[PDB]
Amino acid sequence: GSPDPRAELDSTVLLTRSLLADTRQLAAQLRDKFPADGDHNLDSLPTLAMSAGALGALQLPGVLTRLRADLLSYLRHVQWLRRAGGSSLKTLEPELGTLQARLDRLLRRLQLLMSRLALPQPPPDPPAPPLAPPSSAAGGIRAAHAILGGLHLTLDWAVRGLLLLKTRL
Ligand SMILES: [Cl-]
């Protein structure tokens, strides 16, 4: 019948926590093999909003729209890593492929949530051009740290924001 927004957000948050745990684990595996000297970023990754606090029903559609777009970008980046990241990342498979599959399951769940709740859905933003290959083997590893770290942070803020928003429903 009519969906219970609170229960739908609870379910979505549970699946997001799962993906967050898979991402944290792969990031630790990557750092064990290729230690990193400080935080790493990529220009082609979305900007983290870290939007928590003053989160009410009014913000829910926007939070979900933004998370969908961010996760799609992260998916493209994971796919690129597996494709052109370089031989150095071969042992991160099959874990990176499994992460990609679970990221797809979360995207489907978000689309289902927005449809069931009759929430306005975004206009198709033009797909970004292809990602260039890494400039070097070390550049590919830095990119992997940036992609996994950024995905971790995106999912952490999604959990936090969606649970704070749920408290006002
Ligand atoms: Cl799903």
Residue numbers in the entry: 10 to 178
Describing publication, verbatim:
Interleukin (IL-), an IL-6 family cytokine, has pivotal roles in autoimmune diseases, fibrotic complications, and solid cancers. IL-11 activates downstream signalling pathways by binding its two cell surface receptors: the IL-11 specific receptor, IL-11Rα, and the signal-transducing receptor, glycoprotein (gp)13013,26. Following the formation of the receptor complex, the Janus kinase (JAK)/signal transducer and activator of stat (STAT) and extracellular signal regulated kinase (ERK)/mitogen-activated protein kinase (MAPK) pathways are primarily activated. IL-11 and IL-6 utilise a homodimer of gp13026,34,35 while other IL-6 family members exploit a heterodimer of gp130 with a second signal-transducing receptor, such as LIF receptor (LIFR), OSM receptor (OSMR), IL-27R/WSX-1 or IL-12 receptor β−2 subunit (IL-12Rβ2).
We solved crystal structures of IL-11Δ10/Mutein and IL-11Δ10/W147A at resolutions of 1.8 Å and 1.5 Å, respectively, to understand the structural consequences of the mutations. SAXS experiments show that the crystal structures are representative of the solution structure, and SV-AUC indicates that both proteins are monomeric in solution. The structure of IL-11Δ10/W147A is similar to the structure of IL-11Δ10 (RMSD 0.3 Å relative to IL-11Δ1049), indicating that the W147A mutation does not alter the structure. Thus, the 58PAIDY62 mutations alter the position of the AB-loop, shifting the register of key loop-core interactions by three residues, while maintaining the composition of the interacting residues. This register change is due to a shift of the LX(S/T)LP motif that mediates loop-core contacts: In IL-11Δ10 and IL-11Δ10/W147A the motif is 51LDSLP55, while in IL-11Δ10/Mutein the interacting motif is 54LPTLP58. Conversely, stimulation with IL-11Δ10/Mutein alone does not result in STAT3 activation, demonstrating that the mutations eliminate the ability of IL-11Δ10/Mutein to signal, in agreement with previous reports. Surprisingly, stimulation with either IL-11Δ10/W147A or IL-11Δ10/PAIDY resulted in robust STAT3 activation, albeit with a higher EC50 than IL-11Δ10, of 610 ± 120 pM (p = 0.04 vs IL-11Δ10) and 140 ± 12 pM (p = 0.01 vs IL-11Δ10), respectively. However, a small population of hexameric complex at ~7.5 S was observed in the sedimentation coefficient distributions, indicating that the W147A mutation alone permits some hexamer formation and consistent with the ability of IL-11Δ10/W147A to stimulate STAT3 activation in vitro. In contrast, neither IL-11Δ10/W147A or IL-11Δ10/PAIDY inhibited IL-11Δ10 mediated STAT3 activation, contradicting previous reports that the W147A mutation alone is an effective IL-11 signalling inhibitor.
